[PDB]
Coordinates of C-alpha atoms in Angstrom, one line a residue:
Chain A
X3216 CA 80.2 116.0 103.7
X3217 CA 76.8 114.8 103.0
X3218 CA 75.4 115.3 106.1
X3219 CA 76.3 116.8 109.5
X3220 CA 76.9 115.4 112.8
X3221 CA 73.1 116.6 113.7
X3222 CA 71.8 114.6 111.3
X3223 CA 73.8 111.5 111.9
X3224 CA 72.7 111.9 115.6
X3225 CA 69.0 112.1 114.2
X3226 CA 69.6 108.9 112.4
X3227 CA 71.8 107.0 115.3
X3228 CA 68.9 107.8 117.6
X3229 CA 67.0 105.2 115.7
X3230 CA 69.3 102.3 117.0
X3231 CA 67.9 103.1 120.6
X3232 CA 63.9 102.7 120.1
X3233 CA 63.3 99.2 119.4
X3234 CA 60.4 98.9 117.2
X3235 CA 59.8 96.0 114.9
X3236 CA 58.4 97.6 112.2
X3237 CA 61.2 99.9 111.7
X3238 CA 63.3 98.5 108.8
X3239 CA 67.1 98.7 110.6
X3240 CA 68.5 96.8 107.5
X3241 CA 68.0 99.8 105.5
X3242 CA 68.9 102.0 108.2
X3243 CA 72.4 100.0 108.1
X3244 CA 72.8 100.5 104.4
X3245 CA 72.1 104.1 104.7
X3246 CA 74.8 104.3 107.3
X3247 CA 77.0 101.6 105.2
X3248 CA 76.9 104.1 102.4
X3249 CA 77.1 107.3 104.4
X3250 CA 80.0 105.9 105.7
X3251 CA 81.9 105.5 102.5
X3252 CA 83.0 109.5 103.7
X3253 CA 85.7 108.6 105.7
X3254 CA 85.3 111.2 108.1
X3255 CA 81.8 110.2 108.6
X3256 CA 82.5 106.7 109.0
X3257 CA 84.9 107.6 111.7
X3258 CA 82.5 110.1 113.4
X3259 CA 80.0 107.1 113.1
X3260 CA 82.3 104.6 114.5
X3261 CA 83.5 106.7 117.6
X3262 CA 79.8 107.3 118.4
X3263 CA 78.8 103.8 118.4
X3264 CA 81.6 102.5 120.4
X3265 CA 80.8 105.2 122.8
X3266 CA 77.3 104.0 122.7
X3267 CA 78.5 100.5 124.1
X3268 CA 80.9 101.9 126.5
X3269 CA 77.8 104.0 128.1
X3270 CA 75.7 101.0 127.9
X3271 CA 78.0 98.9 129.9
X3321 CA 61.3 116.2 126.4
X3322 CA 62.0 114.3 123.0
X3323 CA 64.2 111.7 124.4
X3324 CA 61.5 110.0 126.3
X3325 CA 61.6 106.6 124.8
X3326 CA 59.4 104.3 126.7
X3327 CA 61.0 100.6 126.4
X3328 CA 59.5 97.8 127.9
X3329 CA 62.2 96.0 129.7
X3330 CA 60.9 93.7 132.2
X3331 CA 57.1 93.1 133.8
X3332 CA 55.7 96.1 135.1
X3333 CA 59.0 98.0 134.3
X3334 CA 58.7 100.5 131.4
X3335 CA 62.0 102.2 131.3
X3336 CA 63.0 105.4 130.1
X3337 CA 66.5 104.6 127.7
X3338 CA 67.9 107.9 128.6
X3339 CA 68.5 109.3 132.1
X3340 CA 69.6 113.0 131.7
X3341 CA 70.8 115.0 134.6
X3358 CA 76.0 113.0 131.9
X3359 CA 73.5 110.9 129.8
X3360 CA 73.3 107.3 130.9
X3361 CA 71.3 104.6 129.4
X3362 CA 69.2 102.7 132.0
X3363 CA 70.5 99.5 132.2
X3364 CA 67.3 97.4 131.3
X3365 CA 67.4 98.9 127.9
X3366 CA 70.9 98.8 127.2
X3367 CA 70.9 94.8 126.2
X3368 CA 68.8 96.0 123.3
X3369 CA 71.4 99.1 122.6
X3370 CA 74.3 96.6 122.4
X3371 CA 72.0 94.6 120.1
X3372 CA 71.1 97.2 117.3
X3373 CA 74.6 98.7 117.6
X3374 CA 76.1 95.4 117.1
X3375 CA 74.1 94.8 114.4
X3376 CA 75.1 98.1 112.5
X3377 CA 78.8 97.5 113.3
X3378 CA 78.7 94.2 111.6
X3379 CA 77.8 95.8 108.4
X3380 CA 80.2 98.7 108.8
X3381 CA 82.9 95.7 109.4
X3382 CA 82.0 93.8 106.3
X3383 CA 82.5 96.9 104.4
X3424 CA 80.4 114.6 121.1
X3425 CA 77.6 112.9 120.2
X3426 CA 75.6 112.7 123.4
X3427 CA 76.3 116.4 123.7
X3428 CA 74.8 117.2 120.6
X3429 CA 72.1 114.7 121.3
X3430 CA 71.5 116.9 124.3
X3431 CA 71.5 120.0 122.4
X3432 CA 68.6 118.2 120.1
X3433 CA 66.6 117.1 123.3
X3434 CA 66.5 120.6 124.9
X3435 CA 64.9 121.8 121.7
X3464 CA 88.8 99.3 111.4
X3465 CA 91.7 98.1 113.0
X3466 CA 92.6 100.5 116.0
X3467 CA 89.2 100.2 118.0
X3468 CA 89.4 96.3 117.5
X3469 CA 91.1 97.0 120.9
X3470 CA 88.2 98.6 122.5
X3471 CA 85.9 95.7 120.9
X3472 CA 88.2 92.9 122.5
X3473 CA 88.1 94.9 125.8
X3474 CA 84.5 95.2 125.3
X3475 CA 83.9 91.2 126.4
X3476 CA 85.0 92.1 130.0
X3477 CA 81.6 94.3 130.3
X3478 CA 79.0 92.7 132.3
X3479 CA 75.7 93.3 130.0
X3480 CA 78.1 91.5 126.9
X3481 CA 79.3 88.9 129.3
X3482 CA 76.0 87.9 130.5
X3483 CA 73.9 87.5 126.9
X3484 CA 75.1 84.8 125.0
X3485 CA 73.5 86.5 121.9
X3486 CA 75.5 89.9 122.4
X3487 CA 79.0 87.5 122.9
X3488 CA 78.2 85.9 119.4
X3489 CA 77.4 89.2 117.6
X3490 CA 80.4 90.6 118.9
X3491 CA 82.4 87.6 118.2
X3492 CA 81.4 87.6 114.3
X3493 CA 82.3 91.1 114.3
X3494 CA 85.4 90.2 115.7
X3495 CA 85.7 87.4 113.5
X3496 CA 85.3 89.7 110.2
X3497 CA 87.4 92.7 111.5
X3498 CA 90.4 90.4 112.2
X3499 CA 90.9 90.4 108.6
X3612 CA 96.7 92.9 124.4
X3613 CA 97.4 90.1 126.6
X3614 CA 94.4 90.7 128.7
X3615 CA 92.2 91.5 125.4
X3616 CA 93.5 87.6 124.5
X3617 CA 92.8 86.4 128.1
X3618 CA 89.4 88.0 127.7
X3619 CA 88.8 86.5 123.8
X3620 CA 89.8 83.0 125.6
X3621 CA 87.5 83.1 128.4
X3622 CA 85.2 83.1 125.8
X3623 CA 85.9 79.5 125.0
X3624 CA 86.6 78.5 128.8
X3625 CA 83.6 80.0 129.7
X3626 CA 80.2 79.8 127.9
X3631 CA 77.1 79.2 121.4
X3632 CA 78.6 76.8 118.8
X3633 CA 78.8 79.6 116.2
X3634 CA 79.9 82.2 118.1
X3635 CA 82.7 80.3 119.6
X3636 CA 83.7 79.0 115.9
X3637 CA 84.1 82.8 115.3
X3638 CA 86.1 83.1 118.3
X3639 CA 88.1 80.2 116.9
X3640 CA 88.3 82.1 113.7
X3641 CA 89.3 85.4 115.5
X3642 CA 92.1 83.4 117.4
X3643 CA 93.7 82.0 114.1
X3644 CA 93.2 85.3 112.4
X3645 CA 94.9 87.0 115.2
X3646 CA 97.8 84.3 115.4
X3647 CA 98.3 85.2 111.7
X3648 CA 99.3 88.3 112.5
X3649 CA 102.5 88.4 114.8
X3650 CA 104.4 85.2 116.2
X3651 CA 104.5 86.8 119.6
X3652 CA 100.9 87.0 119.9
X3653 CA 100.6 83.5 118.2
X3654 CA 103.1 82.2 121.0
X3655 CA 101.0 84.4 123.8
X3656 CA 97.8 82.9 122.5
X3657 CA 99.2 79.2 122.4
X3658 CA 100.4 79.4 126.0
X3659 CA 97.3 81.2 127.3
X3660 CA 95.3 78.4 125.7
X3661 CA 97.3 75.6 126.9
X3662 CA 96.8 77.3 130.6
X3663 CA 93.3 77.3 130.4
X3664 CA 93.2 73.8 129.0
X3665 CA 95.5 72.7 131.9
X3666 CA 92.9 74.2 134.5
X3667 CA 90.2 72.6 132.7
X3668 CA 91.9 69.1 132.9
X3669 CA 92.7 69.6 136.2
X3670 CA 89.1 70.1 137.2
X3671 CA 88.0 67.4 134.5
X3672 CA 90.3 64.9 136.8
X3673 CA 88.7 66.3 140.1
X3674 CA 85.1 65.4 138.5
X3675 CA 86.0 61.8 136.7
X3676 CA 87.7 61.2 140.1
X3677 CA 84.2 61.7 141.9
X3678 CA 82.6 59.5 139.5
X3679 CA 84.9 56.7 139.9
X3680 CA 84.6 57.2 143.4
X3681 CA 81.0 56.6 143.4
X3682 CA 81.1 53.8 141.3
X3683 CA 83.0 52.4 143.5
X3684 CA 80.3 52.7 145.8
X3685 CA 77.8 51.9 143.2
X3686 CA 79.2 48.4 142.8
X3687 CA 81.0 47.7 146.2
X3688 CA 77.2 46.6 147.6
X3741 CA 70.9 52.0 134.8
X3742 CA 73.6 54.5 135.6
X3743 CA 72.0 57.7 136.9
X3744 CA 74.8 59.0 139.3
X3745 CA 74.4 62.6 139.9
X3746 CA 78.0 63.4 139.4
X3747 CA 77.2 62.3 135.7
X3748 CA 75.0 65.2 135.2
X3749 CA 78.1 67.7 135.4
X3750 CA 79.5 65.4 132.0
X3751 CA 76.3 65.3 130.0
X3752 CA 76.0 69.0 130.7
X3753 CA 75.8 71.0 127.1
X3754 CA 78.5 73.4 128.9
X3755 CA 80.7 70.7 130.3
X3756 CA 84.2 70.8 130.9
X3757 CA 84.3 67.9 128.3
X3758 CA 83.0 70.2 125.7
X3759 CA 85.0 73.2 126.6
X3760 CA 88.4 71.0 127.1
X3761 CA 87.9 69.6 123.5
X3762 CA 87.1 73.0 122.0
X3763 CA 90.1 74.3 123.0
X3764 CA 92.3 71.5 122.1
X3765 CA 90.4 71.7 118.5
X3766 CA 91.5 75.1 118.4
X3767 CA 95.0 74.0 119.7
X3768 CA 95.3 71.5 117.0
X3769 CA 94.2 74.0 114.4
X3770 CA 97.1 76.5 115.7
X3771 CA 99.7 73.6 115.6
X3772 CA 99.6 74.2 111.9
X3888 CA 99.7 69.8 128.0
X3889 CA 101.2 66.7 130.3
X3890 CA 98.2 65.3 132.0
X3891 CA 99.0 61.6 132.4
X3892 CA 97.3 62.0 135.8
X3893 CA 94.2 62.5 133.9
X3894 CA 94.8 60.2 131.3
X3895 CA 95.6 57.0 133.3
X3896 CA 92.6 57.9 135.5
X3897 CA 90.2 58.0 132.4
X3898 CA 91.6 54.8 131.9
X3899 CA 91.1 53.2 135.0
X3900 CA 87.3 54.9 134.9
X3901 CA 86.5 53.7 131.6
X3902 CA 87.6 50.2 132.3
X3903 CA 85.1 50.4 135.7
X3904 CA 82.6 51.6 133.5
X3905 CA 82.9 48.4 131.2
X3906 CA 83.1 45.8 134.1
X3907 CA 79.7 47.7 135.5
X3908 CA 77.8 45.8 132.6
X3909 CA 76.1 49.1 131.0
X3910 CA 76.9 50.1 127.5
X3911 CA 75.9 53.9 126.9
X3912 CA 77.5 54.7 130.5
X3913 CA 80.5 55.2 128.4
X3914 CA 79.5 58.0 126.2
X3915 CA 79.7 60.5 129.0
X3916 CA 83.4 60.4 128.3
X3917 CA 83.2 60.2 124.5
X3918 CA 84.5 63.7 124.0
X3919 CA 87.1 63.2 126.6
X3920 CA 88.3 60.2 124.5
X3921 CA 88.1 62.4 121.4
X3922 CA 90.6 64.6 123.3
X3923 CA 92.7 61.9 124.1
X3924 CA 93.0 60.9 120.5
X3925 CA 93.2 64.6 119.5
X3926 CA 96.2 65.2 121.6
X3927 CA 97.6 61.8 121.2
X3928 CA 97.7 60.4 117.6
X3929 CA 99.1 63.4 116.3
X3930 CA 98.3 63.8 112.6
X3990 CA 101.4 54.5 120.3
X3991 CA 99.8 55.6 123.5
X3992 CA 96.8 55.7 121.7
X3993 CA 97.4 52.3 120.4
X3994 CA 97.3 51.0 123.9
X3995 CA 94.5 52.7 124.6
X3996 CA 92.7 51.2 121.8
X3997 CA 93.7 47.8 122.8
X3998 CA 92.8 48.1 126.8
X3999 CA 89.4 49.7 125.8
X4000 CA 89.0 48.0 122.1
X4001 CA 85.0 47.4 122.7
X4002 CA 84.6 50.5 124.6
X4003 CA 85.7 52.7 121.6
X4004 CA 83.6 50.5 119.7
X4005 CA 80.8 51.5 121.6
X4006 CA 81.8 55.0 120.9
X4007 CA 82.0 54.5 117.4
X4008 CA 79.0 52.4 117.1
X4009 CA 76.9 55.0 118.5
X4010 CA 78.4 58.0 117.0
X4011 CA 77.1 59.0 113.6
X4012 CA 80.3 60.9 113.1
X4013 CA 81.5 59.7 109.8
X4014 CA 84.6 57.5 111.1
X4015 CA 87.0 59.1 108.3
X4016 CA 86.0 62.9 108.9
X4017 CA 86.0 62.5 112.7
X4018 CA 89.0 62.0 114.9
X4019 CA 89.0 58.4 115.2
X4020 CA 90.1 58.0 111.8
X4021 CA 93.7 57.4 112.4
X4022 CA 93.0 53.5 113.3
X4023 CA 91.9 52.8 109.5
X4024 CA 95.1 50.9 109.6
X4025 CA 95.1 49.1 112.9
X4026 CA 91.6 47.3 112.0
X4027 CA 91.4 44.5 114.5
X4028 CA 90.3 47.3 117.1
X4029 CA 86.8 47.4 115.2
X4030 CA 83.7 45.6 114.9
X4031 CA 82.7 44.1 111.8
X4032 CA 79.6 46.6 111.4
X4033 CA 81.6 49.5 112.1
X4034 CA 83.9 48.8 109.8
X4035 CA 81.1 47.9 107.4
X4036 CA 79.6 51.5 107.9
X4037 CA 82.9 53.0 107.2
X4038 CA 83.4 51.0 103.9
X4039 CA 79.8 52.3 102.9
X4040 CA 80.8 56.1 103.5
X4041 CA 84.3 55.9 101.9
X4042 CA 83.2 54.3 99.2
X4043 CA 79.8 56.7 98.9
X4044 CA 82.6 59.7 99.4
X4045 CA 85.2 58.3 96.8
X4046 CA 82.4 58.0 94.2
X4047 CA 80.5 61.1 95.5
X4048 CA 81.7 62.7 92.2
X4049 CA 80.1 60.4 90.4
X4050 CA 76.5 60.4 89.0
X4051 CA 74.9 57.1 89.3
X4052 CA 72.0 56.2 86.5
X4053 CA 69.8 53.6 86.3
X4054 CA 70.7 51.3 83.3
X4055 CA 68.7 48.2 81.6
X4056 CA 69.9 44.5 80.8
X4057 CA 68.5 42.6 78.3
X4058 CA 68.6 39.1 79.0
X4059 CA 67.2 35.6 78.2
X4060 CA 65.9 33.3 81.1
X4061 CA 67.8 30.6 79.6
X4062 CA 71.2 32.4 78.3
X4063 CA 71.5 35.2 81.3
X4064 CA 75.1 34.4 82.1
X4065 CA 76.4 34.6 78.3
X4066 CA 74.2 37.2 77.6
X4067 CA 75.6 39.3 80.9
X4068 CA 79.1 38.4 79.7
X4069 CA 78.8 39.9 76.1
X4070 CA 76.8 43.1 77.7
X4071 CA 78.9 43.9 80.3
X4072 CA 82.6 42.4 80.1
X4073 CA 83.4 45.6 78.0
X4074 CA 81.6 47.8 80.1
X4075 CA 83.4 50.3 82.3
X4076 CA 83.5 50.0 85.9
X4077 CA 81.4 53.4 86.5
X4078 CA 79.3 51.9 83.9
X4079 CA 78.7 49.2 85.9
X4080 CA 78.4 51.4 89.1
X4081 CA 75.1 52.3 87.7
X4082 CA 72.0 50.7 89.0
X4083 CA 70.6 47.9 86.7
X4084 CA 67.2 46.7 85.9
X4085 CA 66.7 43.6 84.5
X4086 CA 64.2 42.5 81.4
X4087 CA 63.7 38.7 80.5
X4088 CA 62.6 38.6 77.0
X4089 CA 58.5 38.6 76.5
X4090 CA 58.0 38.2 80.5
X4091 CA 55.5 40.4 82.1
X4092 CA 56.7 43.2 84.1
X4093 CA 57.5 42.7 87.8
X4094 CA 58.8 44.6 90.7
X4095 CA 62.6 45.2 89.8
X4096 CA 64.2 44.8 92.9
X4097 CA 62.7 41.0 93.3
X4098 CA 63.8 40.7 90.0
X4099 CA 67.1 41.9 90.6
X4100 CA 67.6 39.7 93.7
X4101 CA 66.4 36.6 91.5
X4102 CA 69.1 37.8 88.8
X4103 CA 71.8 38.0 91.6
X4104 CA 70.6 34.4 92.8
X4105 CA 70.6 32.7 89.3
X4106 CA 74.0 34.0 88.4
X4107 CA 75.5 32.9 92.0
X4108 CA 74.0 29.5 91.1
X4109 CA 75.6 29.1 87.7
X4110 CA 78.8 30.2 88.7
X4111 CA 78.8 26.8 90.4
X4112 CA 77.4 25.0 87.2
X4113 CA 80.5 22.8 85.9
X4114 CA 79.3 23.6 82.4
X4115 CA 81.1 27.3 82.7
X4116 CA 83.8 25.2 84.6
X4117 CA 84.5 28.4 86.8
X4118 CA 84.3 26.9 90.4
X4119 CA 84.8 23.4 92.0
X4120 CA 83.9 22.1 95.5
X4121 CA 87.2 20.9 97.5
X4122 CA 87.5 17.1 97.5
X4123 CA 87.8 17.5 101.3
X4124 CA 84.6 19.7 102.2
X4125 CA 82.5 19.3 99.3
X4126 CA 80.2 22.3 100.3
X4127 CA 82.8 25.2 99.5
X4128 CA 84.0 26.2 96.2
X4129 CA 87.6 27.4 94.5
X4130 CA 88.8 28.3 91.6
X4131 CA 88.1 25.4 89.0
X4132 CA 91.8 24.5 87.7
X4133 CA 90.0 23.2 84.6
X4134 CA 89.1 26.2 83.3
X4135 CA 91.3 26.2 80.5
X4136 CA 88.8 24.1 78.8
Chain B
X4275 CA 89.3 49.5 101.2
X4276 CA 88.5 45.7 101.3
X4277 CA 91.5 44.9 103.2
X4278 CA 89.6 46.4 106.4
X4279 CA 87.6 43.2 106.6
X4280 CA 89.1 39.6 107.5
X4281 CA 88.9 36.6 105.4
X4282 CA 86.0 35.5 107.8
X4283 CA 84.5 39.4 107.2
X4284 CA 84.6 39.4 103.4
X4285 CA 82.5 36.1 103.3
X4286 CA 79.8 37.6 106.1
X4287 CA 79.8 40.9 103.7
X4288 CA 79.5 39.0 100.2
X4289 CA 76.6 36.1 101.5
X4290 CA 75.7 37.8 104.8
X4291 CA 75.4 36.6 108.7
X4292 CA 73.6 33.7 109.2
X4293 CA 71.2 33.1 111.9
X4294 CA 72.7 30.2 114.1
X4295 CA 70.0 27.8 116.0
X4296 CA 72.7 27.2 118.9
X4297 CA 69.6 24.3 119.5
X4298 CA 70.3 22.7 116.1
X4299 CA 74.3 22.6 116.8
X4300 CA 73.7 21.4 120.2
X4301 CA 71.6 19.0 118.8
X4302 CA 74.3 17.9 116.3
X4303 CA 77.1 17.9 119.0
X4304 CA 79.2 15.1 119.5
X4305 CA 81.3 14.9 122.8
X4306 CA 84.2 12.7 122.7
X4307 CA 86.4 13.1 125.8
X4308 CA 84.4 16.2 127.7
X4309 CA 80.6 15.3 128.6
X4310 CA 77.3 16.8 128.0
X4311 CA 77.5 18.3 131.6
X4312 CA 80.6 18.9 132.0
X4313 CA 81.5 22.4 133.5
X4314 CA 83.8 23.3 130.3
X4315 CA 81.0 22.6 128.1
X4316 CA 78.4 24.5 130.1
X4317 CA 80.6 27.2 129.7
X4318 CA 81.3 26.9 126.3
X4319 CA 77.6 26.9 125.6
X4320 CA 77.3 30.0 127.8
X4321 CA 80.4 31.5 125.8
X4322 CA 78.6 30.5 122.5
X4323 CA 75.5 32.0 123.3
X4324 CA 77.0 35.2 124.7
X4325 CA 78.6 35.9 121.3
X4326 CA 77.0 37.9 119.1
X4327 CA 76.2 36.8 115.8
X4328 CA 79.3 37.4 113.8
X4329 CA 81.2 35.9 116.7
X4330 CA 78.9 33.2 116.3
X4331 CA 80.1 33.1 112.9
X4332 CA 83.8 33.3 113.2
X4333 CA 83.3 30.3 115.8
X4334 CA 81.4 28.4 112.8
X4335 CA 84.0 29.5 110.3
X4336 CA 86.6 28.5 113.1
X4337 CA 85.2 24.9 113.8
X4338 CA 83.7 24.2 110.1
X4339 CA 85.8 26.6 107.9
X4340 CA 82.6 28.1 106.6
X4341 CA 79.6 30.3 107.8
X4342 CA 77.1 28.5 105.3
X4343 CA 74.3 27.1 107.1
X4344 CA 72.8 23.7 106.1
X4345 CA 69.3 24.1 104.5
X4346 CA 68.4 21.0 106.1
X4347 CA 70.0 21.6 109.4
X4348 CA 73.4 20.6 111.0
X4349 CA 72.3 17.4 111.1
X4350 CA 73.1 16.9 107.4
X4351 CA 76.5 18.6 108.2
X4352 CA 79.2 16.9 105.7
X4353 CA 82.8 16.2 106.4
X4354 CA 85.5 14.6 104.6
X4355 CA 83.9 11.4 105.0
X4356 CA 80.0 12.0 104.5
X4357 CA 77.8 13.6 107.0
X4358 CA 79.9 14.5 110.0
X4359 CA 78.6 16.2 113.4
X4360 CA 80.4 18.9 115.4
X4361 CA 82.5 17.4 117.5
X4362 CA 84.2 18.7 120.5
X4363 CA 87.4 17.1 121.7
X4364 CA 89.2 17.8 124.8
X4365 CA 92.7 18.7 124.3
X4366 CA 94.9 17.0 126.8
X4367 CA 97.9 19.4 126.3
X4368 CA 98.8 22.0 128.4
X4369 CA 95.7 24.8 129.1
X4370 CA 97.9 27.6 127.7
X4371 CA 97.5 26.9 124.2
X4372 CA 94.3 28.1 122.3
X4373 CA 91.8 25.4 120.9
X4374 CA 92.4 23.9 117.6
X4375 CA 90.4 23.0 114.4
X4376 CA 90.4 20.3 111.9
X4377 CA 87.7 21.5 109.6
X4378 CA 87.4 18.4 107.2
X4379 CA 86.3 16.5 110.3
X4380 CA 84.7 19.6 111.6
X4381 CA 86.7 18.5 114.8
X4382 CA 87.3 20.9 117.7
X4383 CA 90.6 19.9 120.0
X4384 CA 89.6 22.1 123.3
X4385 CA 92.0 22.2 126.4
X4386 CA 90.4 21.7 129.8
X4387 CA 90.6 25.6 130.6
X4388 CA 90.4 26.4 134.3
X4389 CA 87.5 29.1 134.1
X4390 CA 84.2 30.4 131.8
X4391 CA 86.4 33.9 131.7
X4392 CA 89.5 32.5 130.6
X4393 CA 88.3 29.9 128.0
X4394 CA 85.9 32.7 126.5
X4395 CA 89.1 35.0 126.0
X4396 CA 91.1 32.1 124.4
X4397 CA 88.2 31.2 122.3
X4398 CA 87.5 34.6 121.3
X4399 CA 91.4 35.1 120.5
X4400 CA 91.3 32.1 118.3
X4401 CA 88.3 33.6 116.3

């Protein structure tokens, strides 16, 4: 017992006062070192968690909370924290708890003023309480905390509402939490899977309602660019599309949801967007298409989809910078008629660079004579390895002046592609019918 | 990794997409059983103008067998027996079969397809 509970209370009062200068990371390292003593740690955490619950004269600390409102953080009459200061007390306490997770108090506090795995249940209940549930920041911090600590039914419902309701990093920490919880018990795995499916079904039902309004309004738009106001609630950063896709990515991460009324009306909606002679107008359904190809095309119906919407799925892929073989649409690598040439060219160039990404490519000289380039190159290169060939060639013509290496390379390629069809090498001959094409010269055995 | 391209697309990858002077082709088209003001021909030119550069190139390969653009223009378009202009022939067989090409004559046989949309679909399915 290095320090008593009154000295710990004096240190912990520093968490309430919001001073920018104060080094609270150093205070966190003091509390961390003190919390190596197990009884000190346990009392510290029980106090910090009582501070969270109570957030949801020496002690005269005036915090500027709003405009023209300078609140006293403590109301003593049994000690309450004025709800304007609460979000800051929460923010500092979750900041301390994140370090302790990497690694009575009120009555003592008034006595002054007058002169991991068990409380995970409390921290999961904390998600229901309003000052936290409001603040995306406090939610993100609490979720990071839970994601660290994780290494019941209502508490999982409250964890899932964090995804079905409103933070990409905080919801990826929520994904980590839901995974690491599912690692624990087959029964919590099952209950969290079934409650994810329940929420995803609610989201799907309301998404079908939204797209039904969208399709109807496109009908009323045509039957007499696209800025249908029904589109706003799909463009929105917090749209049910992004919630549904997020939840499905978590479902698919836990696998290691029958909605054909949605999928067929997404279908006819896409068909009525494509017939409406606008292009980016599809993209307000890109995440619903990516959800379709997540739930389907399991690691078929997606093939009939890629046929009847082929040019649409191509507009999707062409607009997306998501790399074809790292995104969801990678499955269609093998059904190649369903992509545009330049989409396949982009996939080609990205997969080539990915496969050869471990290889450092160098610059490499090639010394040739203007009159012998073909045979000098054959001698130089024909025993070279493929990875040495993959180096960037710069060509030096004997005694010629320096020039732009790019233009000199283009000339080199041009001259070579000419000399290929010089009969003196007997490599290629023109089709006697066409007379402008070229095929392997059957007289190269000379 | 190369097998993602078609036999057309590997040519377009190696030698690049050409710029097609549709006006030069039109200036070097011969109509045998169609005429230059037939509605299927106006649909043909509308379709070919509507195709992007890659589908235009696939058409050029379909009818000439190559994407290569003649330096002097399509007036210098070669066939089996010397300079042969591009040529569109009406295929008097049933109109539920695709157009057909005889590239050594640069010859297109084209059924009298009943509509712009159907003709465009059949041509795009051919290429």
